[PDB]
Amino acid sequence: IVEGSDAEIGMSPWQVMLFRKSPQELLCGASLISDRWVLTAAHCLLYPPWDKNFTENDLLVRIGKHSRTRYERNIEKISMLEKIYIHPRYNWRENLDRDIALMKLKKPVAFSDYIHPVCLPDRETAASLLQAGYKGRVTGWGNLKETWTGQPSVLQVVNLPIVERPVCKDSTRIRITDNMFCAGYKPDEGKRGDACEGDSGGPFVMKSPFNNRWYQMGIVSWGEGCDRDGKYGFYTHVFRLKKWIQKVIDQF
Amino acid sequence: ADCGLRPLFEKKSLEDKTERELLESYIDG
Ligand code: NA
Ligand code: NA
């Protein structure tokens, strides 16, 4: 994450790391939405252009983590994955439409001061909060700047406002859909920041001014570089795909 | 169910360092 800052402790207790087992490698961010259920970007698990095609056994998550350059005994929990579910209309060929996946844990994780699920938005939560100029929060251990294909010690956090659908479309030749939104400061807004490669699957969250709860509105999906004037980060639209998450969840 | 409330912040009536910036974003034109 670019031009962000160190998360305070337990600031994002739903933050999940997704690792390759062997060799042990940090792939992506995720979000905890129940004791059994972790949410991430589909392209963290399946992207044939990078011959990437992970199964349940290939992978492991670490929950309740703050530092990667520490081990956090009796704080961080590690869980294997029982099943991976990719959105059946995930589209990697074109524009990453429905860039969403669910991983179910082998053992349900214990909630602590450091591990706690984020809420998923309802109708009204999407109406009231997902509006242009309104600011959510992005987090992750991803890249610190744009580079070629920046590891930070501490979880990173940046607040970024949502951008009008027409400025998003004008920013890029990439076709965007209703299942996506874009966030970040306009050039000549004066503030900066962005998610980056590595931050994919991490949550874009907003605090409801009604019931004090944190909601996951977005999943870090895509961009062009990181933090360029006149470019914005693109987020999987969590509300528009909620019924799918529900079909998958209501069915163990 | 009891989701979205951080043990170390909401549940202790304590606020993080930048959460007011989000609420200010909702009220601003
Ligand atoms: Na930008
Ligand atoms: Na308003």
Numbering used by the authors:
A (entry chain B): 16 to 36, 36A, 37 to 60, 60A, 60B, 60C, 60D, 60E, ...
B (entry chain A): 1B, 1A, 1 to 14, 14A, 14B, 14C, 14D, 14E, ...
Please share excerpts from the published article on this structure.
In this study, we investigate for the first time the conformation of the protease thrombin and its zymogen precursor prethrombin-2 in the free form using 19F NMR. We labeled all nine Trp residues in thrombin and prethrombin-2 to interrogate the conformational properties of the protein in the absence of any added ligand and Na+. We labeled all Trp residues of thrombin and prethrombin-2 at the 5 position of the indole ring with 19F and solved the X-ray structures at 2.3 and 2.1 Å resolution, respectively. The nine Trp residues are distributed over the entire surface and function as effective reporters of the conformational state of the protein.
